[PDB]
Nucleic acid binder design. Structure first.
Ligand SMILES: [Mg+2]
Ligand SMILES: [Mg+2]
Ligand SMILES: [Mg+2]
Ligand SMILES: [Mg+2]
Ligand SMILES: [Mg+2]
Ligand SMILES: [Mg+2]
Ligand SMILES: [Mg+2]
Ligand SMILES: [Mg+2]
Ligand SMILES: [Mg+2]
Ligand SMILES: [Mg+2]
Ligand SMILES: [Mg+2]
Ligand SMILES: [Mg+2]
Ligand SMILES: [Mg+2]
Ligand SMILES: [Mg+2]
Ligand SMILES: [Mg+2]
Ligand SMILES: [Mg+2]
Ligand SMILES: [Mg+2]
Ligand SMILES: [Mg+2]
Ligand SMILES: [Mg+2]
Ligand SMILES: [Mg+2]
Ligand SMILES: [Mg+2]
Ligand SMILES: [Mg+2]
Ligand SMILES: [Mg+2]
Ligand SMILES: [Mg+2]
Ligand SMILES: [Mg+2]
Ligand SMILES: [Mg+2]
Ligand SMILES: [Mg+2]
Ligand SMILES: [Mg+2]
Ligand SMILES: [Mg+2]
Ligand SMILES: [Mg+2]
Ligand SMILES: [Mg+2]
Ligand SMILES: [Mg+2]
Ligand SMILES: [Mg+2]
Ligand SMILES: [Mg+2]
Ligand SMILES: [Mg+2]
Ligand SMILES: [Mg+2]
Ligand SMILES: [Mg+2]
Ligand SMILES: [Mg+2]
Ligand SMILES: [Mg+2]
Ligand SMILES: [Mg+2]
Ligand SMILES: [Mg+2]
Ligand SMILES: [Mg+2]
Ligand SMILES: [Mg+2]
Ligand SMILES: [Mg+2]
Ligand SMILES: [Mg+2]
Ligand SMILES: [Mg+2]
Ligand SMILES: [Mg+2]
Ligand SMILES: [Mg+2]
Ligand SMILES: [Mg+2]
Ligand SMILES: [Mg+2]
Ligand SMILES: [Mg+2]
Ligand SMILES: [Mg+2]
Ligand SMILES: [Mg+2]
Lengths: 271, 46, 93
RNA sequence: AGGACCGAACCGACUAAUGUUGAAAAAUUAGCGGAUGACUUGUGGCUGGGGGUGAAAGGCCAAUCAAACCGGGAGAUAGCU
RNA sequence: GCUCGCCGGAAGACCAAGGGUUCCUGUCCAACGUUAAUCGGGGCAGGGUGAGUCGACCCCUAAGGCGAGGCCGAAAGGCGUAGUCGAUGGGAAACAGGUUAAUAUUCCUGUACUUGGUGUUACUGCGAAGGGGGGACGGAGAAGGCUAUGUUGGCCGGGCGACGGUUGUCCCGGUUUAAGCGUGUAGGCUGGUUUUCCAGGCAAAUCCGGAAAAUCAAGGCUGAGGCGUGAUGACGAGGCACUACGGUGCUGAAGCAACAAAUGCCCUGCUUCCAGGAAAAGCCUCUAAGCAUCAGGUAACAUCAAAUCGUACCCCAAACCGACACAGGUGGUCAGGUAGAGAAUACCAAGGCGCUUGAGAGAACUCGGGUGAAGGAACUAGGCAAAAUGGUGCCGUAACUUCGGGAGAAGGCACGCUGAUAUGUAGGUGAGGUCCCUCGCGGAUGGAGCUGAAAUCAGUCGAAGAUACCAGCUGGCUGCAACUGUUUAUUAAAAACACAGCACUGUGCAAACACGAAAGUGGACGUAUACGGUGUGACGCCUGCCCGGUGCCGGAAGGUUAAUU
């Protein structure tokens, strides 16, 4: 649910929180945990290669099964837990043979529901099947690109993918960005939409909230000197230039995709 | 007033020590230059 | 056992001072100058074999050399090792 | 509960006076701001000079920064003193 | 030596860093010390640092570094796998008393604890480069139980006061004891067991995980403190006797109770919130290959071992960083009394100091303060500076508003001491005793003793009772920025930067983009509710017209057009 805070202080006046009482108030499953130290936008040369990244809350990585390659063994949803590493919620599922795995929680999932992966799995949310065993017009998430590689599309909270047509060894998908794309019919997909759809309704309310998530402040290029941004300089507010990136590439409308290798699988652009 | 030189023996050894000079060829040339000059103390190590 | 060579090399000199006299008079302890790399086991074995006495325990410490000046010339003395070896109450060396 | 309030430590630096061959190559005194947070601090580590880093002042990068320091080209050149 | 003054959350004591003999003794005053110097962190000589338990070393890892092969690169080299290093973190064990001129949890006494190796005996399935558990973890909040510690009473020793009184409701001092062992409490966590089966833990496993049965319903884990012991001991006010006049030897009374109480412990606990909170080893458990009446494991005992380096001294400073014996800077620990909410502040304790030139005089003028007739901003660029306000409880408080605020708005009353209510109250703590039960650190009752606010009434002193220190000036109109924050280290703190929010645009993942001759890395172990760039800057109402110019996006009929041929 979404809750508006009360303006007891200027920092709380605009905070809008998302609270789900159905999330596990305890600790995560220990054997599926790893450490992931923060980069700070620095590569192995030590240089900042992505700006505005730094600090934030300490996080532990939850290993999530994007492959869903346990065919024929049913599983039951144990609990839903918060995941710091992503905008969606993750689910603890318990396989019949006593195996525990983390999966992306779809919409409508709850503790006690069953899931199944395989060619013969029933068509219902949470079940993973190859897309040649999934009807046309259905809604899927965690879609694979290459058979066995793992889910890579429709992974964020509230995102999904529609199967629009089937022909030959490929199936067409309408991605959430809007483009029509082709993918092998052998690639596996999970039925239903990703949960936590209200995640985009939140409001950070204050600068500290953004600082808690690892973001650092962004300085406008027009606010500095010409020696370190093409937008710099001027006595007072002066622009007189075509907007560009900090490295001189025009940044309002110019396309930058250049990949002839994968151009053959784009049916239409996102428009 | 906090000045610029804040002593720390471990950091001094790690930055300007003999084994730090021998870890690269430029440090080796530093040692060779100091040996050619005749310095009584090649490094800060001792 | 430790060879006769080390046992004849490790001991150097008997230390003399007011503290050494007090130790020898009260705690049955003699203070000796020993080799810089002489372990407590070597000290004990050498004191037993070369003095025909009976040793309880050995305490060691390294004395640092004092920086001096020989008329504007800087000069440091050598470090050495001090041994506090305790007899078993019936030796009276 | 709160980038909530008053207020020591702690972090700073708005005003005035003194000091200006200073006690001090940036301080002292009386007031002043924050003071559970975008806080502060110890230890160790990483980013190197047309490069770094910068909540952006051309700021900082060892009392030096519209291009650090050291050595070399080098006795640069100087229609000037 | 006697007085006086200063600090006392430090100007006292102890760790770390850093320094290295500055520590103690004898000797000396040439130079050094901003003066003198018999003094000294100065010169010379000698002495001083004792560890199985403290720290390092050692075992284990973080960020990161190096990196066999490997990939890439004119050369030099770059990145990185297996590995190997890397603490600021995880891992065994000692306390109290005494002793030096200078060391002590290290020496001596007393009493302990840990790990490892061996040998004897007894019982016996041991075994890893592998599996599982554990180690192992956030912010804030609250309560309960304690302890350090303090106060008072009791007890013991001493005293009867240079000036009126002081055999008493008087004065002064002491009233201390650890680790370890036993007990296992206030308290928190969790159902226990025994079979049977199993797509899981790379193979296996009796271990973990899953499933199904019966059975008992209290077992297990943790846990401050208290109590007995340790301890018929040590220490102890003093006293006696010497003296080389610093001190030294012997002997030694009481050594209880009540109340108060931490920011410390139980507590890695409990509750709650989102921003969702290291790793690995030591440790426990399982087994594989292997060995199988030998090894190996367990248990008791005995013996042996625990090596090497550091330990002096300063450490908010005259010894470290500042060229100085420099109003500077420097991480952590300890935390008494009265008043006080307080680690503020005032005065004190323990403890440490009077800051390495003084002596006179009492001009102008400068600096730091006190007071001031009448006036009260007339000063000045400007109320700059100064003056003023200032606490607690209670009464009371406008426009406006995003309904939270504004607000401590404004303004006002009371406040000391004494007695009574009440030989000290409401309340807190709580013994003896009565009874009961899972028998003990137990439960109900009981109220002695201790402690103890706030209020009302009456009286009373001074000019003044928040009497000192300490401690908001208030109100009205208006520009700018929503706000908390950040910035020109060292003349600019702001209206500048950032900001939550908004919009445009790019990006389908081997993503865009960025660092890189490249390999690779970040983005991100993220996947369009995501990421990057740009502009604007909460919120409310809104954001109108122009595509001619420049840019960008799309198109490709025609014109022109490179290498090539
Ligand atoms: Mg960005
Ligand atoms: Mg932004
Ligand atoms: Mg500017
Ligand atoms: Mg430019
Ligand atoms: Mg202008
Ligand atoms: Mg213009
Ligand atoms: Mg030097
Ligand atoms: Mg030692
Ligand atoms: Mg605040
Ligand atoms: Mg600053
Ligand atoms: Mg000040
Ligand atoms: Mg404020
Ligand atoms: Mg404040
Ligand atoms: Mg400028
Ligand atoms: Mg500088
Ligand atoms: Mg230049
Ligand atoms: Mg030339
Ligand atoms: Mg010249
Ligand atoms: Mg000396
Ligand atoms: Mg003289
Ligand atoms: Mg003199
Ligand atoms: Mg001295
Ligand atoms: Mg001296
Ligand atoms: Mg010993
Ligand atoms: Mg590594
Ligand atoms: Mg490398
Ligand atoms: Mg190689
Ligand atoms: Mg290692
Ligand atoms: Mg360490
Ligand atoms: Mg001492
Ligand atoms: Mg007590
Ligand atoms: Mg606190
Ligand atoms: Mg010491
Ligand atoms: Mg002085
Ligand atoms: Mg000083
Ligand atoms: Mg500080
Ligand atoms: Mg004070
Ligand atoms: Mg005068
Ligand atoms: Mg005056
Ligand atoms: Mg005055
Ligand atoms: Mg007047
Ligand atoms: Mg008057
Ligand atoms: Mg008036
Ligand atoms: Mg006027
Ligand atoms: Mg005038
Ligand atoms: Mg003023
Ligand atoms: Mg004043
Ligand atoms: Mg009264
Ligand atoms: Mg105007
Ligand atoms: Mg502002
Ligand atoms: Mg400035
Ligand atoms: Mg300023
Ligand atoms: Mg990549």
């Amino acid at each position: 649910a979404v809750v508006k805070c009360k303006p007891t202080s200027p920092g709380r006046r605009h905070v809008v929180k998302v609270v789900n009482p159905e999330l596990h108030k305890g600790k995560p499953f220990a054997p599926l945990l790893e450490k992931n130290s923060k980069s700070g936008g620095r590569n192995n040369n030590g240089r900042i290669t992505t700006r505005h990244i730094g600090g934030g809350h300490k996080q532990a990585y939850r290993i999530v099964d994007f492959k869903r390659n346990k065919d024929g063994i049913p599983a039951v949803v144990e609990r839903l837990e918060y995941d710091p590493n992503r905008s969606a919620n993750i689910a603890l599922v318990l396989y019949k043979d006593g195996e525990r795995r983390y999966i992306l929680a779809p919409k409508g999932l709850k503790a006690g529901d069953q899931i199944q992966s395989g060619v013969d799995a029933a068509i219902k949310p949470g079940n993973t099947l190859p897309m040649r065993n999934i009807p046309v017009g259905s809604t899927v998430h965690n879609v694979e690109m290459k058979p066995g590689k793992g889910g890579q599309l429709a992974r964020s909270a509230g995102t999904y993918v529609q199967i629009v047509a089937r022909d030959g060894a490929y199936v067409t998908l309408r991605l959430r960005s809007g483009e029509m794309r082709k993918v092998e019919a052998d690639c596996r997909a999970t039925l239903g939409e990703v949960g936590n759809a209200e995640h985009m309704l939140r409001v950070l309310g204050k600068a500290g909230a953004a600082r808690w998530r690892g973001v650092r402040p962004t300085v406008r290029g027009t606010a500095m000197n010409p020696v370190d941004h093409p937008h710099g300089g001027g006595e007072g507010r002066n622009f007189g230039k075509h907007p560009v990136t900090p490295w001189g590439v025009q940044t309002k409308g110019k396309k930058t995709r250049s990949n002839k290798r994968t151009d053959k699988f784009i049916v239409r652009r996102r428009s | 007033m906090k000045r610029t030189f804040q002593p720390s023996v471990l950091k001094r050894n790690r930055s300007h020590g003999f084994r730090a000079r021998m870890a690269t060829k430029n440090g080796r040339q530093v040692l060779a230059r100091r040996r050619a000059k005749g310095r009584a103390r090649l490094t800060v190590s001792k | 056992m430790i060879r006769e060579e080390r046992l004849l090399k490790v001991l150097r000199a008997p230390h003399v001072s007011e503290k050494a006299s007090t130790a020898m008079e009260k705690s049955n302890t003699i203070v000796l100058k020993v080799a810089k790399d002489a372990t407590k086991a070597e000290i004990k074995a050498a004191v037993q074999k070369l003095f025909e006495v009976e040793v309880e325990v050995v305490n060691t410490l390294v004395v640092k050399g004092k920086v001096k000046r020989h008329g504007q010339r800087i000069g440091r003395r050598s470090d050495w090792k001090k041994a506090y070896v305790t007899l078993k109450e019936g030796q009276n060396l």
